[PDB]
């Protein structure tokens, strides 16, 4: 099973809201090249290559683990969409 | 715009003629030697548009 | 002729471009724009006018020459030097070779 899936289902009033949050966050991480991540270098999801451990390419993995850290804010009408876009482009260039 | 609805109703002959880019006057499809659409036929390029892009 | 209803499920569309083909043309246009960005604006524009990447058609040396306000020999020479720099850059980075099929 997905790690801490239970706690995640506990976070939200509907499981589908969890899904949306996770997917959206994953898209944010893809877009900005994981420069917006709230995960400390030791908290980074890893992948075992032939060479050695590298960053987990999967943005949804990242999204869920981020979500579990309590460092993400979700909900409806938090901020204008274009304002969010522009500020994320500001802080983390693409 | 975003589609919020789908409507269906009867088509007036005037509406039908409004759709039409031409009348098909001939029961012809394609020429036997040239394999190209016959004029005023079911496959006519004059009516239903070009076979080749931008040509 | 015979009927599609005896059948047509086995009949592919050769007309519309495959996603692979379309992606290939896209990457082609983009790469071309890179290699042309490696040139000056005038010579790149001359190449685009002469090969018709702008309005869709190929202008003569008289039309491009009268466009930039020069002689046809001059504009042909510009086309040639542009093509030459393109050949040097391509020989160097070997980027556009794969698109030649």
């Amino acid at each position: 099973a997905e790690p801490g899936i239970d706690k995640l289902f506990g976070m939200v009033d509907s499981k589908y809201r969890l899904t949306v949050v996770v997917a959206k966050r994953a898209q944010q991480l893809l877009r900005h090249g994981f420069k917006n991540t709230v995960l400390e270098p030791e908290e980074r999801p890893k992948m075992q290559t032939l060479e050695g451990l590298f960053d987990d390419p999967n943005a949804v993995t990242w999204a869920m683990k981020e979500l579990l850290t309590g460092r993400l804010v979700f909900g409806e009408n938090l901020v204008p969409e274009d304002r969010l876009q522009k500020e994320m482009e500001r802080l983390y260039p693409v | 715009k975003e589609v919020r609805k789908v409507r269906i109703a009867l088509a007036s002959p005037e509406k039908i003629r409004s759709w039409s880019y031409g009348e098909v006057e001939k029961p012809e499809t394609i020429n036997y030697r040239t394999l190209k659409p016959e004029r005023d036929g079911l496959f006519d390029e004059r009516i239903f548009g070009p076979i080749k892009d931008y040509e | 002729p015979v009927s599609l209803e005896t059948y047509g499920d086995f009949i592919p569309d050769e007309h519309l471009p495959s996603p692979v083909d379309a992606a290939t043309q896209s990457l082609l246009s983009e790469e071309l724009e890179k290699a042309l960005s490696k040139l000056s604006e005038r010579e790149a524009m001359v190449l685009k006018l002469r090969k018709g990447l702008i309005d869709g058609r190929e202008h003569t040396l008289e039309e491009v020459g009268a466009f930039f306000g020069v002689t046809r020999e001059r504009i042909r020479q510009i086309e040639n030097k542009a093509l030459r720099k393109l050949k040097y850059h391509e020989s160097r980075t070997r980027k556009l070779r794969d698109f030649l099929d």
């Binding site: 099973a1 997917a23 390419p57 | - | 980027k95």
Partner: protein, 170 residues
Amino acid sequence: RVDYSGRSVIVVGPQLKLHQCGLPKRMALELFKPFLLKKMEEKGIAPNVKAARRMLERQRDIKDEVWDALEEVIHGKVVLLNRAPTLHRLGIQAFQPVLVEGQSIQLHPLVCEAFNADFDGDQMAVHVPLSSFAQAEARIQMLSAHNLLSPASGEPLAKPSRDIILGLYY
């Protein structure tokens, strides 16, 4: 009918974890092929995409590094497994694929009961969710280990059966 899909015979997976399924290498190579190309361009396996695709085209042109590349590609991702007929929603489930040798799809034992799947020669279809949204939906909602119970009853759906019960009882 859809793209990014495949099918093959199913075979028992006993070593598999519940969230996993064996996916033949070739199948995975084809299904994920664009991702594989992009990854091959990210590493030094190919200068560009077209060269990489022309490289995968012939089977004798396929080397060892592309498989590791494919492994990197499918990491964390899930595929949809489906057996016909689909009577209820558990006719489709999500699995993190494990690349295997051979042409057969490996299926975890428990979920068999839901699929009404046995090893008398049943075949199954594979599907690849593309978007982050699709894969999120699949992993959270459609994962095998995330549905343990029947939506019809509320009794356990994935449960010990056959050999398992026999052993534990024994």
